């Protein structure tokens, strides 16, 4: 279930095709929060046209190493 | 220790920023050589002066970890 | 006896090391030593009273030889705003030259050690001026504690020793106490301020070869005598005067003015010498009020006994405190404490906020020093008052003697006492903790106006009505046709409301949402260390865990791990604890201070002001801002004179650290590590042809407890201690 | 004013600090599509937060040198609404939970096994007992005057 | 001839070396 | 020596002693209650102070004792 | 009135290999205990020092430092097997002295040859209050 | 269903429903009055 959740994020909200078009400046990230209460702050520029919380994971990276390059794989 | 001993020796003689003629900047220009053999060069050179980024972190998207850093030492 | 200790039997049978331990540490319990009676504890405590007195005395004598030999005092009273004071010299072997030249400070011709301790400038007020003047004070004071040992001997004697009678005679002590130690002894230092002090302050050096010579009014002792004592005021100082210059100087001795001296920010001599005239007047009056050898006065037992009230609220009122105070000494000692330590924090209020001395106000280390150290030494003066209270409770509390009067209700309804207590501190801590959390969320959300500031507004209403009028409430003494600032209006009010309505001094700062905060949190800190300090020692004589623990003593490991565990379970244990809050509440308290000031000295208030209401402004613009040059004091590129705070700042961490050691791990596992070290010992060769003479044990459950608590407070002091004169000494502002 | 505080819709330092605010997250806005879904959340938020500094303005709220909106507790009648009637309402709620809870408790302390109605609540009687912290104050003060609120006998 | 120069080592090295040999020797023997 | 005493509250359950890692305790005749047997503490020179005989007395308040007190190698437990 | 068993040195021990948990100076200069048990058969138990010995058929002897540590091995004996054991104390003048059980029968078994020791005719909430036994050498619960 | 409705009643399950409808309430309230100081309306 844990690893199901990883791949679900990173397919729905996550940064993951475009950080695959430019590695080395896009800001891997696959968690966004709910504009609640000012926490929407918390959702930065991690390029790509997209704002969330940046990821440490290091799934980018796994996913780039076996080959994803869409969406509809994760 | 074994982390805080990777951190800093990473952060100082390993990672940073190449540039045109090859010269390497590290993060720490290689502070860890001279100033880790005393206790008060840890406590100045590695967490004094690497705690500061968590400080600051209030305002920003790095919030989070300010919060949790503050409420971590509670 | 046969072997150290001989007070005790039962420690000295002991085979192993425990008994040296135990031995020192019950050194001074009298009542707990073998054929111990009444006649002996109190002559016991009468001599050792004498040789405390003995070193005090060598102490403060040593502090005026060191800086009359080793010192910086004439040099320091020709400009003493543009030269540090020298505490003593530096001798130190592993010093190497870079230190040499770093610590040879305030025009030395060595190594030195700046003093903070502020004796420059009280003796400086007070009339010193040369290095003869120190060294005839220091001679005396040697010759002072000698004679102070001389008695402590004398009384020791068969011959010379007073019987317990004597020692229980209370309304001569204090007929004595109050009229003489405290009467006679005030009315003198008027008579050596007025005679030397306020001289000294004009220009003028009266001296014990001249003194008969000069007089200290041009008219002296007319107009006590005849009545008309306003002509020792007649001629005050005028505002512009150079300190123990001439320049500007006036005659009067005694007057009240209420403000500071314009040049030293500092209160007029002549207003401290008519404070003491008159407080001497004030216990010399009041000290003839028991009853002795002459026939008239009170009888503090009727006093006691009389005040009942009918309707019977308070039980049997007071009826048996008299003996029960006079016949317990923990119970004496227990109060003398709670009034010494509310009197000492009340001295590091007013120290700071209206100094004494001159030229004390412009050295802000000195100041925060000061403070500082008056504020922890009342911090375990209280401590110690609560845990003799509980001590009481055990030992001398006797329970049909005290039938129904108010020490009995007190131990009846404790656990209304104890509940309510604690609702209190939930209350406090719930809230404060609750506020400065959201404060903190505000603030990292980048939203500063979504706080919870709470203006204090009482505070700031007790302060306008005290004279200060920055917020506008118009109110007593910052009225204009009140009867309080009319009716003072010419005597002292002037030059109070001069000095309250300006805002470079201490007195009466300007306070804030900040200030909301924080003493919140020092009523938090105040009523839990309560909380646990009166719940120990209501519950000391037994509790429903164990109804019997008043035959256990006072200090005890605990009572197994039956009925669910009993650890820590004593009275000392609660005190044990109370002192881990002490300690955090007194922590609150100076960090306060140090940051209003230190924030107050360099003209930038509005940093404190703004940046207080939040904890990570605690942590960052207070703890880790001020924290640069101390933790600078030596680096890869060398040293300077702050290097030795910079050592000592660690220094406080180790040994608060290992504080730890002794407070998590128990004596269980220590004991095992130490019985296989002692199989290693004897089992090996070339050393096991030596051997011990007490079997080694893991120290006891009680006193590693005590020792972890010691380690724990040391370091704490220290590093604080570290943090605070390198912040203040390196900005020096 | 009171506190020498004064109006925040009249201060400066509070106008300049919603500017300030409002200048950061405008700059957030920009570097993306003028339209997109992050350049719209932004548009969001800059909006509540002029919404959020005009409330306060229109409120009265008191503003200090730092423009912060500072809250007086003191009782004067121009400021109840900062502490003093949040304040009757959280008595009035707190007392609503605690009245049920021991109205609860009491319900259940017949039984044999107590502690099981503990353990494993009994909806139906709760939810039978909920609605009475409604008049819980008034039920409170005549269970004081009746002598029933307080245990006698402890 | 410079005071410190004796007395911070008598102090500091001699002074503690006999008290704690002579205290030791009469802590650690029975009468 | 720690010291050992025992009440009159004692209904006999002989629980405690069986409880004593250094025999310290026995039973003994009485007639106070329905057991006719009550705990001594005859050999109180061996008790360590472990107090499991509190531990195992089912009388409240209890009515085995064990006030700790001087100490000897043998109340140390010390092996060496 | 129950001569207690003279101990009968030749009685063999078990068959142990040896072990760092045994005997020490104290053994040497002040007492240690000696446990004796009859063993229906030859069998494996735990030491209550080390490992696993072997007890013999036959008398063992056992030499313990500590008496709690005899009566653990006792306990263990007496109710994992169904052994009966006596134990005593030797010093190290050549004196031996019968421990336990003391008089024939297990405390936990009421004989009726023992008088009462420590016993107090009162309930524990009867003592004085400590102030009563202030400046005299007695102890509150000794009374 | 009985032994289901009983389950659903235990203590910890009870006061997770219980505190998840509440913080359900509460977020709703601040985002239809969202920064509020004070009670504005009277
Ligand atoms: C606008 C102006 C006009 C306003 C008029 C306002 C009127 C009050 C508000 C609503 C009135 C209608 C309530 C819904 C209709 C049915 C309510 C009902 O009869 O439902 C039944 C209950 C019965 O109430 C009492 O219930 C008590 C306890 O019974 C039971 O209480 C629980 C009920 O589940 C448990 O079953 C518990 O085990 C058991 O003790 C009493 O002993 C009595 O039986 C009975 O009088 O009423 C209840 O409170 C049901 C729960 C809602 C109560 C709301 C009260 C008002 C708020
Ligand atoms: C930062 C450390 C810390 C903290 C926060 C506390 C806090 C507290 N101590 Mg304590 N104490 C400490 C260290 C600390 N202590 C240390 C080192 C010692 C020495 C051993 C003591 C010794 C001590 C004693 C002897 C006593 C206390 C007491 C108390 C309580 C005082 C009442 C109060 O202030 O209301 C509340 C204050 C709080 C800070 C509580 C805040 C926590 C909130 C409620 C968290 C909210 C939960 C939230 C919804 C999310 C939870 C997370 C989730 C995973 C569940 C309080 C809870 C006294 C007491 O019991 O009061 C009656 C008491 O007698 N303390
Ligand atoms: C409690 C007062 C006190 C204190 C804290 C100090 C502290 C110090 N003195 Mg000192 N001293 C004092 C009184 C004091 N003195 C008095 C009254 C005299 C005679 C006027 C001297 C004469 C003196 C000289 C000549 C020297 C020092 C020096 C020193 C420093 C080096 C440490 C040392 O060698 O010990 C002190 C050495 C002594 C000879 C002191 C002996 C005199 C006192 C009265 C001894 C008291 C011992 C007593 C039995 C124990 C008291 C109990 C208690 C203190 C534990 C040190 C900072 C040395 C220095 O200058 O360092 C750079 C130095 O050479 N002192
Ligand atoms: C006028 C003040 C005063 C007086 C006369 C007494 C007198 C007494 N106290 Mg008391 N006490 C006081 C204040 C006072 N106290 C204060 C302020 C506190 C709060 C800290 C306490 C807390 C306290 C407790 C908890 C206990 C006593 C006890 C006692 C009795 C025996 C003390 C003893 O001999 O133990 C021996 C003396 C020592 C063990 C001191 C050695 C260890 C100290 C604490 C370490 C010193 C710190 C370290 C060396 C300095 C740093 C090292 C360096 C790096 C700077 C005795 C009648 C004990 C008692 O028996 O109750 C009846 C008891 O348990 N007191
Ligand atoms: C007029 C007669 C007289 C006088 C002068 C004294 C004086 C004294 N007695 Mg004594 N006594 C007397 C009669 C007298 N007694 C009689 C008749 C009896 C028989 C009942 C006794 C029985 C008796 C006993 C049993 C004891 C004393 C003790 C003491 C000493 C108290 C301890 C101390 O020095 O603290 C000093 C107190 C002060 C300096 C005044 C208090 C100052 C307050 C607390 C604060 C001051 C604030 C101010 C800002 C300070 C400035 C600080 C700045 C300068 C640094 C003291 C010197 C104790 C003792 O002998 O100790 C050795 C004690 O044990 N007396
Ligand atoms: C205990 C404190 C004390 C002491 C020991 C002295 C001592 C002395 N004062 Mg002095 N004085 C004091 C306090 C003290 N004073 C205070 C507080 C003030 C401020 C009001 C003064 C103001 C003062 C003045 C103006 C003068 C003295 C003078 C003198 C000297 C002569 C006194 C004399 O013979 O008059 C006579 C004594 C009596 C008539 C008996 C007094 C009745 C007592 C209470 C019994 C003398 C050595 C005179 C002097 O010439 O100095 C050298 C002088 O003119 N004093
Ligand atoms: C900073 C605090 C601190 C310190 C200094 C120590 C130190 C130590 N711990 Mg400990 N521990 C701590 C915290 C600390 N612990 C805490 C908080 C816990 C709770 C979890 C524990 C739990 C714990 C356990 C369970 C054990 C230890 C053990 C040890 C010892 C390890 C052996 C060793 O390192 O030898 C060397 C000693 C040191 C490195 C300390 C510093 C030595 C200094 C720098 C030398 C200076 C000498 C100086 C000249 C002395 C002369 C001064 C003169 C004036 C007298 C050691 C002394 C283990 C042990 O016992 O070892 C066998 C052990 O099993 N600790
Ligand atoms: C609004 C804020 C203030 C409210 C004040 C409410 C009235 C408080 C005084 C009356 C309290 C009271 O009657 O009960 C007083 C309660 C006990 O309550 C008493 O109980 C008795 C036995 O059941 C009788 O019923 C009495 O009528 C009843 O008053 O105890 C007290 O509060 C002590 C005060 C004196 C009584
Ligand atoms: C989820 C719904 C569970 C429904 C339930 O447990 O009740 C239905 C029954 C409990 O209900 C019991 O049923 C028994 C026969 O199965 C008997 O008829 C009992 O009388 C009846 O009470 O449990 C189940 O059958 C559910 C099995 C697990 C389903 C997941
Ligand atoms: C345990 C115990 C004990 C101890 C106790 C204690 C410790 C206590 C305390 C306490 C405290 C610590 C207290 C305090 C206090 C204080 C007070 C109570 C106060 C006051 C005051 C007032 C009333 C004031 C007034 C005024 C004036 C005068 C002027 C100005 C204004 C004003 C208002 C400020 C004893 C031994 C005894 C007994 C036993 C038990
Ligand atoms: S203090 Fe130690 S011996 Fe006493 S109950 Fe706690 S764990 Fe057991
Ligand atoms: S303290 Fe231990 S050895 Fe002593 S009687 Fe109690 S259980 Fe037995
Ligand atoms: S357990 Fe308690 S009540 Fe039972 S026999 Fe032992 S001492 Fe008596
Ligand atoms: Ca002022």
């Known amino acids: 279930l844990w690893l199901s959740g990883m791949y679900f994020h990173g397919a729905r909200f996550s940064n993951y095709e475009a950080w695959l078009n430019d590695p080395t400046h896009i800001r891997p990230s696959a968690q966004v929060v709910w504009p609640i209460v000012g926490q929407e702050i918390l959702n930065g520029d991690v390029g790509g046209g997209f704002r969330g919380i940046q990821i440490t994971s290091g799934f980018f990276q796994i996913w780039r190493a076996s080959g994803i390059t869409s969406e509809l794989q994760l | 220790v074994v982390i805080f001993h990777f951190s800093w020796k990473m952060q100082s003689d390993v990672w940073g920023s190449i540039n045109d003629q090859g010269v390497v900047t590290h993060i720490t220009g290689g502070n860890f050589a001279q100033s880790s053999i005393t206790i008060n060069g840890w406590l100045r050179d590695f967490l004094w002066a690497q705690a500061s980024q968590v400080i600051q972190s209030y305002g920003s998207s790095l919030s989070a970890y300010g919060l949790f850093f503050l409420g971590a030492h509670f | 006896a046969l072997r150290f200790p001989r007070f005790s039997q039962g420690l000295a049978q002991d085979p192993t090391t425990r008994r040296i331990w135990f031995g020192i540490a019950t050194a001074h319990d009298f009542e707990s030593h073998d054929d111990i009676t009444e006649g002996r504890l109190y002559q016991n405590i009468f001599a050792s009273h004498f040789g405390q007195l003995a070193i005090i005395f060598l102490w403060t004598s040593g502090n005026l030889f060191h800086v009359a030999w080793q010192g910086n005092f004439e040099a320091w009273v020709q400009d003493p705003l543009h030269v540090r004071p020298i505490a003593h010299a530096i001798w130190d072997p592993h010093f190497g030259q870079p230190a040499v030249e770093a610590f040879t400070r305030g025009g030395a011709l060595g190594p030195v050690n700046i003093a903070y301790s502020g004796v420059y400038q009280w003796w400086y007020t007070i009339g010193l001026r040369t290095n003869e003047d120190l060294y005839t004070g220091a001679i005396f004071l040697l010759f002072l504690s000698f004679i102070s040992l001389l008695a402590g001997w004398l009384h020791l004697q068969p011959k010379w020793k007073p019987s317990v009678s004597w020692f229980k005679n209370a309304e001569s002590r204090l007929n004595h106490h109050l009229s003489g130690l405290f009467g006679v002894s005030s009315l003198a230092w008027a008579g050596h301020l007025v005679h030397v002090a306020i001289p000294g302050s004009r220009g003028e050096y009266v001296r014990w070869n001249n003194f008969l010579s000069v007089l200290p009014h041009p008219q002296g002792l007319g107009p006590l005598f005849t009545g008309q004592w306003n002509l020792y005021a007649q001629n005050p100082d005028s505002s512009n005067h150079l300190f123990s210059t001439s320049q500007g100087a006036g005659t009067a001795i005694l007057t009240l003015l209420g403000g500071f001296h314009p040049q030293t920010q500092s209160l007029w001599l002549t207003d401290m010498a008519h404070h003491h005239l008159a407080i001497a007047i004030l216990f010399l009056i009041g000290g003839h009020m028991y009853r002795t050898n002459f026939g008239i006065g009170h009888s503090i037992k009727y006093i006691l006994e009389a005040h009942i009230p009918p309707g019977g609220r308070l039980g049997r009122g007071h009826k048996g405190l008299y003996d029960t105070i006079n016949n317990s000494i923990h119970f004496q000692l227990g109060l003398a404490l709670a009034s010494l330590g509310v009197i000492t924090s009340l001295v590091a209020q007013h120290m700071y906020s209206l100094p004494a001395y001159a030229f004390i106000a412009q050295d802000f280390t000195t100041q925060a020093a000061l403070y500082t150290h008056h504020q922890y030494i009342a911090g375990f003066i209280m401590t110690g008052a609560f845990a003799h209270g509980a001590i009481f409770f055990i030992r001398d509390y006797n329970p049909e003697q005290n039938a129904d009067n108010v020490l009995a209700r007190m131990l009846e309804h404790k656990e209304a006492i104890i509940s309510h207590l604690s609702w209190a501190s939930l209350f406090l801590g719930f809230h404060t903790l609750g506020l400065y959390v959201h404060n903190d969320v505000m603030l990292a959300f980048g939203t500063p106006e979504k706080q919870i500031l709470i203006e204090p507004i009482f505070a700031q209403w007790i302060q306008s009505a005290h004279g200060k009028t920055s917020y506008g409430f118009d109110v007593l003494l910052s009225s204009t046709n009140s009867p309080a600032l009319n009716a003072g209006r010419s005597i002292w009010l002037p030059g109070w409301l001069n000095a309250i309505n300006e805002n470079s001094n201490s007195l009466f700062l300007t306070i804030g949402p900040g200030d909301f905060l924080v003493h919140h949190a020092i009523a938090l800190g105040l009523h839990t260390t309560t909380l646990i300090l009166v719940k120990g020692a209501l519950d000391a004589r037994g509790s429903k865990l164990m109804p019997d623990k008043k035959d256990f003593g006072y200090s005890f490991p605990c009572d197994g791990p039956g009925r669910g565990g009993t650890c820590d379970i004593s009275a000392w244990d609660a005190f044990y604890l109370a002192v881990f809050w002490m300690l955090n509440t007194i922590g609150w308290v100076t960090f306060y201070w140090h940051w209003k000031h230190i924030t107050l000295w360099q003209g930038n208030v509005s940093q404190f002001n703004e940046s207080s209401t939040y904890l990570m402004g605690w942590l960052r613009d207070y703890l880790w801002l001020n924290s640069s040059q101390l933790i600078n004091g030596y680096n890869p590129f060398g040293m300077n004179s702050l290097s030795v705070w910079a050592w000592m700042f660690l220094f406080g961490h180790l040994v608060w650290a290992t504080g730890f050691m002794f407070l998590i791990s128990w004596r269980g596992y220590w004991q095992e590590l130490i019985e296989t070290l002692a199989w290693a010992h004897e089992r090996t060769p070339l050393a096991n042809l030596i051997r011990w003479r007490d079997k080694p044990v893991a120290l006891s459950i009680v006193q590693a407890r005590l020792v972890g608590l010691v380690h724990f407070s040391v370091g704490y002091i220290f590093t604080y201690a570290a943090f605070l004169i390198a912040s203040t000494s390196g900005k020096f502002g | 004013d009171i506190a020498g505080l004064t109006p925040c819709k009249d201060s400066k330092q509070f106008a300049k600090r919603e500017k300030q605010s409002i200048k950061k997250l405008e700059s957030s806005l920009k570097l993306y599509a003028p339209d997109s879904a992050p350049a719209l959340a932004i548009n969001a938020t800059i909006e509540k937060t002029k919404r959020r500094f005009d409330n306060y303005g229109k409120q009265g709220l008191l503003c200090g040198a730092d423009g912060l909106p500072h809250l007086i507790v003191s009782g004067d009648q121009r400021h109840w609404g900062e502490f003093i009637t949040p304040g009757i309402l959280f008595l009035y709620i707190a007392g609503w939970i605690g009245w049920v809870g021991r109205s609860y408790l009491i319900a259940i302390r017949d039984d044999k096994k107590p502690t099981q109605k503990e353990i494993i609540i009994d909806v139906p009687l709760a939810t039978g007992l909920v609605f009475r912290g409604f008049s819980w104050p008034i039920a409170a003060y005549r269970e004081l005057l009746n002598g029933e609120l307080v245990a006698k006998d402890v | 001839i410079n005071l410190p120069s004796l007395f911070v080592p008598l102090v500091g090295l001699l002074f503690p070396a006999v008290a704690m040999a002579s205290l030791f020797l009469h802590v650690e023997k029975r009468l | ?80 | 009135g129950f001569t207690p068993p003279e101990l009968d040195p030749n009685t063999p021990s078990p068959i142990f290999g040896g072990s760092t948990g045994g005997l020490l100076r104290k053994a040497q200069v002040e007492e240690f205990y000696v446990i004796t048990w009859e063993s229906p058969k030859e069998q494996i138990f735990e030491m209550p020092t080390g490992g696993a010995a072997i007890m013999r058929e036959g008398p063992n002897l056992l030499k313990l430092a500590r008496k709690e540590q005899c009566l653990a091995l006792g306990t263990r004996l007496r109710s994992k097997y169904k052994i009966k054991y006596q134990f005593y104390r030797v010093f190290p003048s050549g004196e031996v002295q019968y421990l336990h059980p003391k008089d024939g029968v297990y405390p936990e078994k009421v004989n009726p040859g023992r008088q009462g020791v420590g016993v107090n005719f009162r309930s524990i909430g009867k003592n004085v209050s400590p102030i009563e036994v202030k400046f005299t050498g007695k102890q509150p619960y000794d009374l | 269903m009985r032994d289901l409705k009983t389950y659903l009643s235990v203590a910890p399950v009870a006061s997770t429903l219980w505190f998840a409808a509440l913080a359900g309430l509460l977020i709703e309230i601040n985002r239809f009055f969202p920064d509020a100081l004070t009670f504005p309306f009277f």
């Open chain 6, 1 to 80: 020596s720690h010291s050992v005493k025992i009440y009159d509250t004692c209904i006999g359950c002989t629980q405690c002693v069986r409880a004593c890692p250094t025999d310290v305790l026995e039973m003994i005749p009485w007639g106070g209650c329905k057991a006719k047997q009550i705990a001594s503490a005859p050999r109180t020179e061996d008790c360590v102070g472990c107090k499991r005989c509190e531990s195992a007395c089912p009388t409240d308040f209890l009515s085995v004792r064990v006030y700790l007190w001087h100490e000897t190698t043998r109340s140390m437990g010390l092996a060496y």
